[PDB]
Curated annotation (Swiss-Prot):
TM stretches of this protein: none
Protein name: Lactoferricin-H
Effect of residue 29 to R: Decreased antibacterial activity against Gram-positive bacteria; seems to reduce susceptibility to localized juvenile periodontitis; associated with increased plasma lactoferrin concentrations and possibly with susceptibility to coronary artery stenosis
Site (Interaction with PspA): 5, 14
Region described as Interaction with lipopolysaccharide: spans on this chain: 21-31
Disulfide bonds: 10-46, 20-37
């Protein structure tokens, strides 16, 4: 209970952060067919950083 328990991004409604397995060859910046969406930055690439 630091400040806000709920923000205004994906973290609000994301009970599954492991689904990242198959989407589209070019989801965010993935090269060929789906591979990895977490191998781009340190923080989540959701609504905000």
């Amino acid at each position: 209970g630091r400040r806000r328990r709920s923000v205004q991004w994906c973290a609000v409604s994301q009970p599954e952060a492991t689904k990242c397995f198959q989407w589209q060859r070019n989801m965010r910046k993935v090269r060929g067919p789906p591979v990895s969406c977490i191998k781009r930055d340190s923080p989540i690439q959701c609504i905000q950083a």
